Design an enzyme around this catalytic site. Sequence first.
Site, PDB file in Angstrom:
ATOM      1  N   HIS A  38       0.848  -1.199   0.000  1.00  0.00           N
ATOM      2  CA  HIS A  38       0.000   0.000   0.000  1.00  0.00           C
ATOM      3  C   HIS A  38       0.879   1.243   0.000  1.00  0.00           C
ATOM      4  O   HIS A  38       2.053   1.178   0.357  1.00  0.00           O
ATOM      5  CB  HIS A  38      -0.820   0.078   1.296  1.00  0.00           C
ATOM      6  CG  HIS A  38      -1.820  -1.022   1.461  1.00  0.00           C
ATOM      7  ND1 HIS A  38      -2.857  -1.240   0.572  1.00  0.00           N
ATOM      8  CD2 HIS A  38      -1.979  -1.923   2.459  1.00  0.00           C
ATOM      9  CE1 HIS A  38      -3.607  -2.232   1.020  1.00  0.00           C
ATOM     10  NE2 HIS A  38      -3.076  -2.690   2.143  1.00  0.00           N
ATOM     11  N   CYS A  85      -4.521   5.384  -1.580  1.00  0.00           N
ATOM     12  CA  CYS A  85      -3.493   4.418  -1.874  1.00  0.00           C
ATOM     13  C   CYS A  85      -3.437   4.304  -3.391  1.00  0.00           C
ATOM     14  O   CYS A  85      -4.444   4.043  -4.024  1.00  0.00           O
ATOM     15  CB  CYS A  85      -3.854   3.072  -1.234  1.00  0.00           C
ATOM     16  SG  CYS A  85      -2.751   1.749  -1.816  1.00  0.00           S
ATOM     17  N   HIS A  88      -4.564   0.925  -5.059  1.00  0.00           N
ATOM     18  CA  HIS A  88      -5.898   0.498  -4.687  1.00  0.00           C
ATOM     19  C   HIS A  88      -6.938   1.608  -4.767  1.00  0.00           C
ATOM     20  O   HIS A  88      -8.079   1.413  -4.360  1.00  0.00           O
ATOM     21  CB  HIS A  88      -5.869  -0.120  -3.301  1.00  0.00           C
ATOM     22  CG  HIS A  88      -5.003  -1.328  -3.223  1.00  0.00           C
ATOM     23  ND1 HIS A  88      -4.097  -1.528  -2.202  1.00  0.00           N
ATOM     24  CD2 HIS A  88      -4.882  -2.391  -4.055  1.00  0.00           C
ATOM     25  CE1 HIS A  88      -3.456  -2.668  -2.408  1.00  0.00           C
ATOM     26  NE2 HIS A  88      -3.931  -3.222  -3.511  1.00  0.00           N
ATOM     27  N   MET A  93      -9.838   2.443  -2.013  1.00  0.00           N
ATOM     28  CA  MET A  93      -8.930   2.660  -0.887  1.00  0.00           C
ATOM     29  C   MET A  93      -8.514   4.126  -0.825  1.00  0.00           C
ATOM     30  O   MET A  93      -7.440   4.513  -1.310  1.00  0.00           O
ATOM     31  CB  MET A  93      -7.731   1.710  -0.916  1.00  0.00           C
ATOM     32  CG  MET A  93      -6.926   1.758   0.385  1.00  0.00           C
ATOM     33  SD  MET A  93      -5.761   0.397   0.543  1.00  0.00           S
ATOM     34  CE  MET A  93      -5.029   0.900   2.167  1.00  0.00           C
TER      35      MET A  93
HETATM   36 CU   LIG Z   1      -3.487  -0.094  -0.942  1.00  0.00          CU
END
Ligand SMILES: [Cu+]
Length: 100
Positions: A38, A85, A88, A93
């Site tokens: 991440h 992120c 993501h 995210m």
């Molecule tokens: Cu992530």
Amino acid sequence: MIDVLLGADDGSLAFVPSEFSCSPGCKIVFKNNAGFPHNIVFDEDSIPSGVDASKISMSEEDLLNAKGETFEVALSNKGEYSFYCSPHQGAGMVGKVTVN
Ligand SMILES: [Cu+]
């Protein structure tokens, strides 16, 4: 300070918490939990005027690769700071910290 998990315990691709509030001097510690790699990115157009994004953000190219790795942020200016992120973001995210 506020501790934020990168990935929910169940592996969901989320910041936990994702939306939260604090005050000038706010410190946030993001910790790799599940679903990594991440990272944490703030875009200049999504944080308050006069805040240098490069001083609070990871580069989109950099990643936290292992459980327990951390990235720390300290905020001063009041206002809304959206973050995400990068790998993501398309999975939702994302988050927002409000400094009041
Ligand atoms: Cu992530």
